[PDB]
């Protein structure tokens with residue numbers, strides 16, 4: 434599928450993000466089943482909120498949940514499902530499931546794709562509304578099964594550290 | 606594609622439904638061409654009505670038209686195209702084309718995915734509006750070529766019977 | 778992917794068009810990377826305008842940019858991403874990038890799919906609004922990299938000539 438996409442053209446500040454779910458999609462949590470390579474519904478989330486940004490992952494990375502590193506990509510409008518955006522990390526939302534670490538990175542489009550985010554260097558350069566919504570969305574991002582907690586934010590450096598760790602984890 | 610998805614985790618009341626077309630999609634009738642594995646437009650339907658629910662099929666089933674068993678899945682909001690919903694049958698709309706039987710099952714999300722439909726056991730537990738719309742939509746679900754009739758509804762048991770028959774038909 | 782789809786059932790007036798981007802999609806320019814077979818974002822376009830029609834290509838054709846022949850397909854409503862529409866050419870918008878020729882064909886659904894466009898034989902049979910929008914959209918259809926110009930329109934015959942040339946180019 435996306436295996437032949439590098440994690441980026443110049444890591445960790447220049448990455449490729451495969452988009453699973455476009456911005457403003459309904460509050461539905463999915464997962465890619467590695468065994469069948471199909472997208473499954475996990476949860477119809479108990480929130481009126483919709484996806485605050487486009488949602489997917491960096492190809493050829495490995496996070497602590499066995500899945501590729503998660504990324505939200507802020508764009509002017511929702512992109513096509515399944516498309517790939519060359520991107521630049523600007524921050525990270527820290528999450529722990531009861532199974533471990535579970536970071537959600539924030540990225541903007543690469544300067545080659547648009548001039549609009551060129552001076553967005555940190556996540557705090559984005560509207561406070563968007564950051565609020567992002568936090569509140571993932572506070573409800575979990576399955577029904579009894580047995581997720583949203584901590585704080587990390588900066589651009591912390592996001593780049595997450596990527597480097599995630600890339601090293603995959604090649605290992 | 607979806608061949609490695611079982612027809613369900615516990616048949617026939619616990620099924621997997623691959624979604625071709627999300628709820629509220631334009632009135633366009635498609636078919637999967639088995640020979641090329643691509644989705645083709647068959648008809649721009651002569652109705653203002655839009656898809657009343659998500660529309661797809663159960664993998665590894667065989668209906669009397671050579672295609673997998675058709676299913677509509679009622680959800681809070683439209684799902685992503687191509688995603689898979691673990692589901693529970695609640696009824697069936699009976700249709701005959703001039704080529705034979707052509708049932709359209711009604712299913713809700715599995716209890717693992719949402720609490721909202723837990724007490725929806727029969728299709729008649731759903732709003733009468735939705736059932737009207739479903740009937741009126743498929744009354745227009747046909748190609749232009751000269752040479753479809755919508756009868757009535759069957760209950761949850763009848764839907765489960767359709768699934769068991771469809772699963773038996775595939776393994777044969 | 779779409780390699781097993783013929784360029785049409787009866788060339789050049791009866792073609793098959795694989796749709797990448799539905800009508801009314803956000804102003805985002807994509808390309809299919811032949812090496813990875815994935816859809817990439819090229820540009821978030823500097824226009825408020827959205828896709829004026831469905832956008833894709835004819836399988837098994839070869840244009841002067843190494844990509845299959847581009848086509849816009851006018852429909853009542855946006856189609857599903859990735860679906861295939863049997864279509865009929867009615868005109869062409871001429872474009873030159875700084876790299877050569879770059880025609881954008883205009884097609885309507887085949888008579889088998891809908892009665893609505895049966896008497897639309899030329900692109901000038903379509904609303905002048907739509908033609909204006911089409912022209913203005915592609916005036917902004919380009920990457921940011923320094924180094925596209927929209928000329929005029931050709932008729933149905935000229936579009937069919939583009940197809941025949943494109944089909945001959947592929948078999949060569």
Ligand SMILES: [Cl-]
Nearest residue numbers: 547548549823
């Ligand atoms: Cl720009």
Ligand SMILES: [Cl-]
Nearest residue numbers: 479719720721
């Ligand atoms: Cl719930």
Ligand SMILES: [Cl-]
Nearest residue numbers: 651891892893
């Ligand atoms: Cl019609």
Ligand SMILES: [Mg+2]
Nearest residue numbers: 489490500503
């Ligand atoms: Mg993920």
Ligand SMILES: [Mg+2]
Nearest residue numbers: 661662672675
């Ligand atoms: Mg079907």
Ligand SMILES: [Mg+2]
Nearest residue numbers: 833834844847
């Ligand atoms: Mg193209």
Ligand code: NA
Nearest residue numbers: 498500503535
């Ligand atoms: Na994850």
Ligand code: NA
Nearest residue numbers: 670672675707
């Ligand atoms: Na069928």
Ligand code: NA
Nearest residue numbers: 842844847879
């Ligand atoms: Na082109």
